[PDB]
């Protein structure tokens, strides 16, 4: 059962991750693309989503890969036009817009899928199963990378709604909220904001789950001595250590063998299954935690980043 | 009679909560907790922990302190088996309110996130008039001198204290009650004095799910005019709420209202929720403010002076 698919926003994530994953998934037929960049070979091309929707009435689904600040208008137009919708993360620039999109999709009988690619990393499900029945003592997240190495020349990240360092940091939060059994409350946050941008370049979160387990997180996009994408969960049965952003796992000091990394193949497989079953999948809890940090966090100005 | 403790005895507690409680025979004011002066005629405590330990029979608590301490207080009260009424905003974050609601539901206790402005007398007549009408646009103007209306307050300037969204969320609580469809924030601008953490002025550009534009201007700076107005343009004329919800006109004609009794109405509703075994936790006004802090552009302005 082939689902015809359009991709909206042909940036580097689309070309590097989405198009290769789609082209390797038999359940989808890549039919159309929309962007203002180079024409994509082998599909029908459009420069905006309005033109794509007007010319592709039979199209089944769209996958949205553009920056989050345009996500609501695009997803709304796609749902109004009768298409199933897959969202890159974060699923919106605000929480209200995601709630409205979910309600609209449910009313129209269409699949809406808020994706979290890091939740499909190979360590996540083994970690979730190991932690389900165990006494958890503390969680530490360290998510540090040089923005100039990992997001060279990107500007939407610095604009209102662009998350700054919570762009990678929400990936860590999407893993934490999937592997931990209880919900998190933000007790304190500090956001470090360069004077020439609108979003933080570094942040610290102090959270607690509903049993009082301390959950601390450090996100940093400044140049530093180490790049690391680590989540450590201390338990009465030893430390569970996720590293390499979810691609590496050790439990009580022992490495755990994992399946190969296939985050975006797993996302598209799940999108196809959601469509097939008439279901949606919209978990906004990672975005709610980020919203709480922007609402409750203390802001500290720092020197200009240089854009 | 529901035995009631009040937590946080500042001037809103002294001027609004206690008079409303004392005039409502459905409650018996039993205990107060505050680090400030003792309250006369009740048992007094310096903190909620001591109150809970000494008042095991107590039925309910009403939390009136700043929102930055409300989660720890409400959680302790729910863990102690008390029904809980929250001043607005119901938390400093959305996650804490979701956790409190789930805890209350698991324990079989009433949790009530109050919005005093939703009980202003214009609100229900405005909601009923707008329910079946074609709306074209909404304008909110909520402007007051902070030094007049919140003199000497500091929590408003600290992280989680909302700044001008302290009164502004009252306007949003009215708008989200009178309008039939949900709102999406499209743009916000927050003006933040260099010596505080929260905005002193803000503009919001929203749209409802039919595309109706909903614009709001909030300002705490000294200005020529103080105003607390919501105007809804419709195919059948303008609905105009003024005086914070204490005055209403529809299509150019004044509308008779009942007495302005926001806090009496809140406590009556809390009593009814307890009696019916229900909770009432609408966080949509806070979600809109969260969206403004997450998506809004921030502009520094001159120091406020505190």
Curated annotation (Swiss-Prot), chain A:
Its EC number is 1.1.1.376, 1.1.1.120, 1.1.1.48. This is L-arabinose 1-dehydrogenase (NAD(P)(+)). Keywords: Arabinose catabolism, Carbohydrate metabolism, NAD, NADP, Oxidoreductase. InterPro entries: Gfo/Idh/MocA-like_OxRdtase_N, Gfo/Idh/MocA_oxidrdct_glycsds, NAD(P)-bd_dom_sf. Pathway: Carbohydrate degradation; L-arabinose degradation via L-arabinono-1,4-lactone pathway. One of its GO terms (biological process) is L-arabinose catabolic process. Monomer. It catalyses: alpha-L-arabinopyanose + NAD(+) = L-arabinono-1,4-lactone + NADH + H(+); alpha-L-arabinopyanose + NADP(+) = L-arabinono-1,4-lactone + NADPH + H(+); D-galactose + NAD(+) = D-galactono-1,4-lactone + NADH + H(+); D-galactose + NADP(+) = D-galactono-1,5-lactone + NADPH + H(+). It comes from Azospirillum brasilense. The lineage of its organism: Bacteria, Pseudomonadati, Pseudomonadota, Alphaproteobacteria, Rhodospirillales. The active site is at 89 (proton donor). Catalyzes the NAD(P)(+)-dependent conversion of L-arabinose to L-arabino-gamma-lactone. Is involved in a degradation pathway of L-arabinose that allows A.brasilense to grow on L-arabinose as a sole carbon source. Prefers NADP(+) to NAD(+) as electron acceptor. Displays high catalytic efficiency for both L-arabinose and D-galactose in vitro. However, the enzyme appears to be involved in the metabolism of L-arabinose but not D-galactose in vivo. Disruption phenotype: Cells lacking this gene do not grow on L-arabinose as a sole carbon source but grow on D-galactose, D-xylose or D-glucose at the same growth rate as the wild-type strain.
